[PDB]
Amino acid sequence: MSEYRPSRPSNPRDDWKLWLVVNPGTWLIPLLITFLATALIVHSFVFTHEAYNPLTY
Amino acid sequence: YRPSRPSNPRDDWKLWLVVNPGTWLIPLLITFLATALIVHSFVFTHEAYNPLTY
Amino acid sequence: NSISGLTEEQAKEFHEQFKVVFTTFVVLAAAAHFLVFLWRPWF
Amino acid sequence: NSISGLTEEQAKEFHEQFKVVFTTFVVLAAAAHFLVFLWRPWF
Ligand code: BCL
Ligand code: BCL
Ligand code: BCL
Numbered sequence A: 001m002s003e004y005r006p007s008r009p010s011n012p013r014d015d016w017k018l019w020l021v022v023n024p025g026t027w028l029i030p031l032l033i034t035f036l037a038t039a040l041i042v043h044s045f046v047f048t049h050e051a052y053n054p055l056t057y
Numbered sequence B: 001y002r003p004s005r006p007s008n009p010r011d012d013w014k015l016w017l018v019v020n021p022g023t024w025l026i027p028l029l030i031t032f033l034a035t036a037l038i039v040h041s042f043v044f045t046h047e048a049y050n051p052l053t054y
Numbered sequence C, D: 001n002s003i004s005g006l007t008e009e010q011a012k013e014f015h016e017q018f019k020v021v022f023t024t025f026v027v028l029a030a031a032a033h034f035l036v037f038l039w040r041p042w043f
């Protein structure tokens, strides 16, 4: 006669509860740094088909 | 319970209430190099836009 | 105390600036796709 | 404490030099593009 089941969470109501798990003081910048790593990569792939590169001679 | 609100660029400085500069300033000054080098490469490789250009 | 160690009030106060920053970013971002599509359509 | 452990003043005094250095950087940064455009325009 005992169990512990967790509340089915409906997002984004409970969205903030992340920072109870992820300490932004440690991870905000790792995050921001990786959105950069992403942005840089996507940039390369479209920067390389010169049709979308702004230089072209 | 509690809710809240922001309003930057006023509240901008509350950043360093989250991100400690003594730990993270140089790491992000560094990733601008990393960015600024990545940009240069993609244009220095465009042989028209560099000073040496052969 | 939680895993991250923040309060409810820090997580909630933080999350505000996050999603506020996020949106204007994702709005700024949404804008450039417009321009590019004008400038260089794709698909 | 705060999440970062700084104080209201350190959070504020620092942000000032950051803005200050940022600006004169993104002003220098603004400057260069002018010249590159003259040395070799693009769009
Ligand atoms: C072939 C591709 C197209 C083009 C299509 C696009 C498209 C499409 C997009 C971009 C976007 C961006 N492009 Mg572009 N881009 C081109 C060529 C360039 C060139 C170049 C040398 O030729 C450069 C330097 C850039 C640079 C950039 C960045 C400014 C930006 C990605 C930012 C980032 O890192 O988010 C990484 C995420 C982070 C969180 C890192 C931190 C970034 C900042 C600091 C976040 C907070 C700012 C706060 C919300 C706002 C403050 C600003 C003031 C209010 C004004 N592009 C050509 C013309 N580019 C993206 C963008 O964001 O547009 C808005 C985007 O959607
Ligand atoms: C198409 C290629 C063009 C050209 C177009 C551009 C453009 C466009 C830009 C540059 C910029 C830069 N280029 Mg160039 N560049 C060319 C060729 C070169 C060559 C070469 C071997 O041929 C070299 C060595 C460089 C080198 C440089 C860097 C000095 C600089 C990037 C700074 C940085 O790291 O920010 C990374 C950011 C950081 C924050 C890291 C820390 C940097 C320092 C410590 C900041 C604080 C200093 C404070 C603000 C001011 C103090 C200094 C004094 C007051 C002067 N270029 C050719 C001719 N170059 C950029 C610039 O203006 O930078 C300012 C820029 O916008
Ligand atoms: C011709 C021009 C190119 C092009 C050039 C570029 C360039 C260049 C750039 C973009 C950028 C973006 N492009 Mg585009 N792009 C094109 C076509 C597309 C297509 C498509 C229909 O095929 C898609 C899906 C996209 C999509 C996107 C986005 C992923 C991104 C903007 C940020 C954002 O709100 O991110 C995703 C938002 C979410 C996933 C929502 C997430 C909700 C969560 C809960 C937020 C919290 C996350 C949590 C805190 C942290 C999680 C963990 C971390 C993820 C590790 N583009 C065309 C073909 N695009 C920019 C970029 O790279 O941004 C980073 C950029 O610089």
Ligand code: BCL
Pocket (backbone or CB within 6 Å): A029, A032, A033, A036, A054, A055, B028, B031, B032, B035, B036, B037, B039, B040, B043, B049, D026, D029, D030, D033, D036, D042
């Ligand atoms: C032929 C000449 C080339 C060219 C050559 C170069 C070269 C070479 C360089 C640049 C650089 C830059 N170029 Mg250019 N560039 C070209 C065309 C463009 C285009 C375009 C679509 O045509 C765009 C949008 C840009 C934009 C940019 C900027 C991203 C950047 C200069 C200032 C800066 O960093 O402000 C930054 C401001 C913001 C991103 C806005 C938000 C400010 C935030 C709110 C401040 C807080 C940040 C927070 C604390 C921490 C963020 C954490 C980190 C994400 C981890 N260029 C053409 C095609 N450019 C220089 C660079 O790399 O600078 C670093 C550089 O070296």
Ligand SMILES: CC(C)=CCC/C(C)=C/C=C/C(C)=C/C=C/C(C)=C/C=C/C=C(C)/C=C/C=C(C)/C=C/C=C(\C)CCC=C(C)C
Pocket (backbone or CB within 6 Å): A035, A038, A041, A042, A045, B012, B014, B015, B016, B017, B018, C010, C013, C014, C015, C017, C018, C019, C021, C022, C025, D003
């Ligand atoms: C009061 C207290 C305590 C405190 C205060 C608070 C604060 C200040 C806070 C702060 C905050 C902030 C800044 C935040 C920020 C935010 C942001 C900006 C965010 C952003 C985000 C972004 C994202 C999420 C994105 C993502 C993306 C993705 C996932 C994408 C991907 C893509 C792909 C993969 C594609 C690729 C392709 C090819 C390569 C081709």
Ligand SMILES: CC(C)=CCC/C(C)=C/C=C/C(C)=C/C=C/C(C)=C/C=C/C=C(C)/C=C/C=C(C)/C=C/C=C(\C)CCC=C(C)C
Pocket (backbone or CB within 6 Å): A036, A039, A040, A041, A043, A044, A047, B032, B035, B038, B039, B042, D010, D013, D014, D015, D017, D018, D019, D021, D022, D025
């Ligand atoms: C008193 C006490 C306590 C203290 C004092 C304080 C101090 C000393 C402070 C200091 C500060 C400083 C130094 C600061 C600095 C700043 C700076 C310089 C900054 C800079 C910044 C920059 C930025 C933000 C930028 C960014 C950019 C970006 C994000 C971009 C990106 C781009 C892309 C992605 C594109 C790509 C392209 C291709 C690949 C082609």
Ligand SMILES: CCCCCCCCCCC[N+](C)(C)[O-]
Pocket (backbone or CB within 6 Å): C026, C029, C030, C031, C033, C034, C037
């Ligand atoms: C929100 C991130 C951008 C998504 C790009 C998808 C291609 C759509 C082209 C027009 C862009 N948009 C519909 C947002 O105006």
Ligand SMILES: CCCCCCCCCCC[N+](C)(C)[O-]
Pocket (backbone or CB within 6 Å): C032, C035, C036, C039, D043
């Ligand atoms: C950051 C996103 C940049 C979007 C690119 C917009 C370039 C518009 C310049 C086009 C000039 N023209 C129409 C004369 O070719």
Ligand SMILES: CCCCCCCCCCC[N+](C)(C)[O-]
Pocket (backbone or CB within 6 Å): D026, D029, D030, D033, D034, D035, D037
């Ligand atoms: C952040 C400062 C760099 C912004 C680059 C924007 C490029 C668009 C054309 C700029 C023309 N110039 C400013 C080169 O005359």
